[PDB]
Amino acid sequence: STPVTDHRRRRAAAVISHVEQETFEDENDQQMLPNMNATWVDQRGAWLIHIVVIVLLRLFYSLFGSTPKWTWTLTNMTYIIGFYIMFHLVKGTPFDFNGGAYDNLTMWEQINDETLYTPTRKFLLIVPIVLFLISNQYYRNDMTLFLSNLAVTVLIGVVPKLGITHRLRISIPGITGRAQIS
């Protein structure tokens, strides 16, 4: 019992693993159509909206009355967590693309058809660090807030976006579960 057409999805049999490159048919299916999921990034106003959401968050948290350090740390953590949830958590497309063709890539890896260090990727890398530098001037006298904020930034907003973590899946038993490699 051997299949004439092998289109079967494997799972990671290790702890640290990489998603396997695609074959000829898979590449053709991916390149047949412009990806409707990761093309809005390059259009008019995307960078500006990334700027504006931060200002809105700042005004909201300032409305909650609390001291500058608390408002700024809340702004930083909220933006970083939201960006991670939107761009790095869910893999696939929210609509039927093809035979599926992107069932094991997140939205971050889909940008600019997997071309690294493009201007947009550079901008989205720069934003977290400058946001940390701006907020650094207010809770600088508290070791706990400073350390926690720096940890959250460097570990959630700069590491997943690095060029060495591309197509990197970490699969532990009891939490993440078996990842998808083929």
Partner 1 sequence: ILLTRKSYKPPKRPLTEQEIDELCDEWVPEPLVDPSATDEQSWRVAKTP
Ligand X SMILES: CCCCCCCCCCCCC/C=C/[C@@H](O)[C@H](CO)NC(=O)CCCCCCCCCCCCCCCCCCCCCCC
Q: Which residues bind ligand X (CB under 6 A)?
A: 37, 40, 49-50, 53, 57, 78-79, 82-83, 85-86, 90, 94, 107
- Residue among 167, 164, 160, 170 at smallest CA distance from 14: 170
From the list ligand X, partner 1, none, partner contacted by residue 40 (C-beta under 5 to 8 A by kind): ligand X
Question: Closest distance between partner 1 and the C-beta of residue 125, in Å?
Answer: 5
Which residue type is seen at 169?
R
From the list ligand X, partner 1, none, partner contacted by residue 21 (C-beta under 5 to 8 A by kind): partner 1
From the list ligand X, partner 1, none, partner contacted by residue 37 (C-beta under 5 to 8 A by kind): ligand X
List residues binding partner 1 (CB under 8 A): 21, 114-119, 122, 125-126, 166-167
Task: Report whether 90 contacts 107 (CB < 8 A).
Answer: yes
Task: Report whether 75 contacts 58 (CB < 8 A).
Answer: yes
Residue 82 Cα to chain centre, angstroms: 10
Question: Closest distance between ligand X and the C-beta of residue 94, in Å?
Answer: 5
From CA 79, how far away is CA 85, in angstroms rounded? Answer: 10
